[PDB]
């Protein structure tokens, strides 16, 4: 994957986006995601994985001040709310708009209209790994039909009977919680589905083409290394696109077979 | 016992120097008492009204469906003033009302209100204007059937 072709792809795509939005123009250019599309020879996963994987970016996403973050933790929510109000930095305190534990989430948001209201009221959802297996049933297809706002896993449990939430929270230190929350907010998300296609949001239209090229390169490297089974002989195609633009190829494979074991005369 | 425990907590809070609202939360209870419920209906605060079917004297509740219809309140007639008393920790209750509930039960309250509307009020929309009674005795009905059969035969 040559980086110059990626850089000229970002340049051409941004020029196309601006000339399409010219026909408020800067508001239309803003909030326009850039999608990296991976096509594989086989299904990347044998079943639906509803927990996104995190890829760390040199240029983190969701850095705007208007992004609202909803944090779902284990019981009790009072300790985490006190940690929000008291011992978090100001930018994260402004970013996090709601803290609600799993019991209150199950109590108040069992209805589909309540789930849709919670979906509309926030942009980024973070979720503790202790309770994230119970969130598909608690949030339904409202949060899990579309992979855009699926809850990103965060680690809040302190690393090592029934635990009473009032006496203990079993939580890791607050600066570690801060670092984990910032890392998960800034990290790009990969969603594993039984498909030959995978779409990853890598940036916006107002960003620089060098930033898009670096982000695309690092997510390609980490995602082929980690999340793609059978490495590079499973990767078929790479594309960069917008919500309404066409797909610009980056790396198209030469071998369309999986391996030599598919060869039979 | 719950009221004594809440009052002990509030007295502790006052003695240490915070308001009672710092330790106590806003209650959500079934509203009861006939004068109180009629006042809530007149002030349009009641969301759902349940009226017992066996209030003696009947004059205490005979105006209540008309009052609820004028004020737009959903009402339902239910069997058992003792059944309402079991809700309100009393022997009997003539009428109960819901004004507001908690957020985890607002969906259930809306579903119950719609169910009560569609399955009770639309069905009793026509039958509430009819005259009751007029049923004949067993021997009177048999005599009437016998004389109608005789008139049809002759």
């Amino acid at each position: 994957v040559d980086p110059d072709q990626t850089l000229k792809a970002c340049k051409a795509l941004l020029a196309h986006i601006k000339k399409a939005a010219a026909a408020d123009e800067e508001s239309t250019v803003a909030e326009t995601p850039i999608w990296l599309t991976l096509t594989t020879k086989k299904h990347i996963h044998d079943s639906h994985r509803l927990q996104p994987g995190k890829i760390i970016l040199p240029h983190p996403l969701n850095t705007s001040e208007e992004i609202s973050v909803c944090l779902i933790t284990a019981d009790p929510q009072r300790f985490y709310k006190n940690a929000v109000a008291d011992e978090f930095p100001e930018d994260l305190r402004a970013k996090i708009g709601r803290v609600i534990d799993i019991s209150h989430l199950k109590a108040k948001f069992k209805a589909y209209e309540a789930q849709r209201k919670l979906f509309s009221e926030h942009d980024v959802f973070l979720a503790d790994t202790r309770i994230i297996n119970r969130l598909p049933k608690a949030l339904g297809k409202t949060f899990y039909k579309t992979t855009t706002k699926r809850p990103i896993p965060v680690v809040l449990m302190a690393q090592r009977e029934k635990r009473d939430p009032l006496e203990n929270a079993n939580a890791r230190p607050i600066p570690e919680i801060v670092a984990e929350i910032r890392k998960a907010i800034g990290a790009a998300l990969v969603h594993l589905s039984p498909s030959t296609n995978t779409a990853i949001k890598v940036g916006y239209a107002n960003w620089e083409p060098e930033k898009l090229a670096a982000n695309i390169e690092t997510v390609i490297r980490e995602l082929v290394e980690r999340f793609v089974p059978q490495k590079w002989q499973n990767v078929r195609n790479f594309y960069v696109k917008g919500p309404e633009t066409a797909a610009l190829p980056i790396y198209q494979t030469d071998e369309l077979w999986l391996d030599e074991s598919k060869v039979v005369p | 016992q719950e009221k004594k425990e809440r009052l002990l907590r509030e007295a502790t809070a006052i003695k240490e120097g915070k308001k009672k609202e710092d330790v106590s939360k806003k209650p959500y209870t079934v509203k009861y008492g006939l004068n109180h419920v009629v006042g809530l209906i007149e002030n349009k605060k009641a969301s759902l009204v349940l009226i017992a079917n066996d209030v003696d004297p009947i004059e205490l509740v005979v105006f209540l469906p008309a009052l609820c219809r004028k004020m737009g309140i959903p009402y339902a007639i239910i069997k058992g003033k003792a059944r309402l008393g079991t809700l309100v920790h009393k022997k009997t209750a003539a009428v109960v009302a819901i004004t507001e509930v908690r957020s985890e039960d607002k969906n259930e309250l809306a579903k119950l209100i719609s169910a009560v509307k569609e399955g009770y009020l639309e069905k009793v929309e026509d039958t509430r204007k009819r005259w009751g009674g007029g049923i004949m005795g067993f021997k009177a009905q048999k005599r009437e059937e016998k004389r109608k059969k005789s008139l049809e035969t002759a």
């Binding site: 209805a111 209209e113 309540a114 209201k117 | 006042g39 007149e42 002030n43 349009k44 969301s47 004028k70 004020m71 737009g72 309140i73 507001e100 607002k106 969906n107 309250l109 809306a110 209100i113 719609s114």
Partner: peptide, 26 residues
């Protein structure tokens, strides 16, 4: 005859004005 859908259904009334015995505090 003359937010959430749950909120609208719970708060829905008729167009007739409310009746008050007196002015209440608060």
């Amino acid at each position: 005859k003359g937010g959430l859908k749950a909120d609208e259904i719970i708060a829905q009334r008729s167009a007739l004005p409310a009746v008050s015995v007196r002015k209440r505090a608060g």
